[PDB]
Write a protein that holds these residues in place. Structure first.
Motif, mmCIF file in Angstrom:
data_model
loop_
_atom_site.group_PDB
_atom_site.id
_atom_site.type_symbol
_atom_site.label_atom_id
_atom_site.label_comp_id
_atom_site.label_asym_id
_atom_site.label_seq_id
_atom_site.Cartn_x
_atom_site.Cartn_y
_atom_site.Cartn_z
ATOM 1 N N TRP A 24 30.446 48.726 39.437
ATOM 2 C CA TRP A 24 31.143 48.788 40.283
ATOM 3 C C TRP A 24 30.885 47.179 41.264
ATOM 4 C CZ3 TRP A 24 32.238 53.309 43.730
ATOM 5 C CH2 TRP A 24 33.008 54.413 43.026
ATOM 6 N N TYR A 25 30.167 46.541 40.836
ATOM 7 C CA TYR A 25 29.818 44.991 41.398
ATOM 8 C C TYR A 25 31.271 44.483 41.251
ATOM 9 C CZ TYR A 25 28.576 40.327 42.254
ATOM 10 O OH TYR A 25 28.641 39.117 43.030
ATOM 11 N N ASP A 26 31.662 43.694 42.376
ATOM 12 C CA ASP A 26 33.006 42.982 42.258
ATOM 13 C C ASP A 26 33.084 41.644 41.993
ATOM 14 O OD1 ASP A 26 35.745 43.377 42.888
ATOM 15 O OD2 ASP A 26 35.668 42.937 45.134
ATOM 16 N N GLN A 59 38.712 46.763 42.560
ATOM 17 C CA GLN A 59 38.064 45.653 42.092
ATOM 18 C C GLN A 59 38.757 44.598 41.866
ATOM 19 O OE1 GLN A 59 35.653 48.317 39.091
ATOM 20 N NE2 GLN A 59 34.238 46.931 40.126
ATOM 21 N N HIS A 90 30.465 53.048 36.525
ATOM 22 C CA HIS A 90 29.389 52.715 37.387
ATOM 23 C C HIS A 90 27.978 52.614 36.627
ATOM 24 C CE1 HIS A 90 26.557 52.485 40.618
ATOM 25 N NE2 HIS A 90 27.352 52.704 41.527
ATOM 26 N N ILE A 135 26.993 47.482 47.032
ATOM 27 C CA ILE A 135 28.074 48.415 46.771
ATOM 28 C C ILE A 135 28.085 49.718 47.265
ATOM 29 C CG2 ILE A 135 28.411 49.961 44.491
ATOM 30 C CD1 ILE A 135 27.255 47.616 42.970
#
Ligand code: Q9L
Ligand code: CL
Lengths: 240, 237
Positions: A24-26, A59, A90, A135
């Motif tokens: 989930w890090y963009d 994202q 995730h 996040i």
């Protein structure tokens, strides 16, 4: 066939270059992943593809892939729907770690367990994780319930929260006759492909969708594929 | 106090903003793209956050919005596109420069069109080079025969923008959603005229600047509490 569906998996991201788990890090596209999206969009343009609605995640590596494709096919005016339910898997506490840090912290036996398992999640992203607020506290997830915002996901979890969006929001559009383009991530697209083809857990875990390449499904009126998924592009790109 | 931000796109390719670009789907020039980048930078520096974005179906506005969302790291926001925020349809004048317009129609009639709120230009006819390009464009296929213009007075443009404002944008503002609108000179004129209760002559002299965030603070009845302000460095402001 009655219906036509196109999927596209985004290409290389900034953290792929660092072999770090994004999840989930963009992370944004790398320049090469952006070029991949441009070639996929050119493939769609050369084949004269037309869409009526687009779906993507929240994202930016997927959103920028979609934008690049729409630019290439001159369909920047299409409606676009974004949903967290199409997000990448995730990766929990592994988020932000690279290959070496993961093997060092957890050992190759545990890492192989996570790699080969359909339903064993990685460790949870705890409040002291360096990306926890980045996040879990991002306002883009402000409308998720407590049970909806994951701390970690197995592939089973990822597919389990992608498929409600497929069933509730995408399927009706397809049966409305809309030509759908989905720009998303390897594991959320795995969820869709598993549902479309009735694949086993084993089969879906060995499925590695190519990046930056339009994936075409011809579907009957019940959304059953009438032939194997097809890749669009020049001869060399398709072979690889 | 609700906060509303408008942005008008900048320069389009081939000098088309000086050629009645209208409903022709002209892209931004590199300079107009850079303008959008500076506007987004201004919004980022000021820490602006949005919850929903509205734009036209014309790529120069859409690309302006995309550039702004990129600069402010808010590419995840929901975006709604509508033909009702399109630029004014300039009819048969679309694509002509000033000299060509005057040569074709005469200075007297051009002055009348320039100064009139309710007189449209001549319609775009089948011999116009943009006729099938615009009128048969797939993005307008759901429009009824009465909705798809062959030409528009400023009054016409405002008349079809304001139903979208009332039915789609106002309820978002009244729920507290922070709205960003990226559109065109004349559709944004429609919004500003409704907001500030301007006269036809007043709106017709208002020339909104390009590429600059335009900030409104509205009370609970969506009346501006103060004049519109512009974000940026001091000189550009
Ligand atoms: O070696 C493999 O092919 C491999 C493949 C998959 C997995 C895996 C999958 C799910 C879970 Cl929950 C855990 C592990 C682990 C692997 N072994 S690995 O040495 O630890 C590693 C770890 C990160 C990456 C990586 C990360 C980001 C961008 C590019 C590369 C690459 C390799
Ligand atoms: Cl968009």
């Amino acid at each position: 066939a009655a219906y036509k569906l196109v999927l596209i998996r985004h290409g290389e991201s900034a953290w792929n270059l660092e072999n770090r788990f994004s999840g989930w890090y963009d992370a944004d596209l790398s320049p090469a992943g952006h070029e991949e999206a441009k070639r996929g969009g050119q493939a769609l343009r050369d084949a004269g593809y037309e869409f009526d609605i687009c779906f993507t995640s929240v994202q930016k590596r997927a959103i920028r892939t979609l934008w690049t494709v729409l630019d290439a096919i001159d369909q920047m005016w299409l409606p676009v729907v974004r949903t967290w339910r199409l997000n990448e898997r995730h990766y929990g506490g592994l988020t932000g770690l690279n290959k070496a840090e993961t093997a060092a912290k957890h050992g190759e036996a545990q890492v192989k367990i996570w790699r080969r398992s359909y339903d064993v999640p990685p460790p949870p992203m705890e409040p002291d994780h360096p990306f926890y607020s980045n996040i879990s506290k991002d306002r883009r997830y402000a409308d998720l319930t407590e049970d909806q915002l994951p701390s970690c996901e197995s592939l089973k979890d990822t597919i389990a929260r992608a498929l409600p969006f497929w069933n509730e929001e995408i399927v009706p559009q397809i049966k409305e006759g809309k030509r759908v383009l989905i720009a998303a991530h390897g594991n959320s697209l795995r969820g869709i492909v598993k549902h479309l083809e009735g694949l086993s857990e084993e089969a879906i875990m060995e499925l590695n969708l190519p990046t930056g390449i339009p994936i075409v499904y011809e579907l009957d009126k019940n959304l059953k594929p009438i032939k194997p998924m097809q890749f669009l592009g020049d001869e060399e790109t398709v072979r690889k």
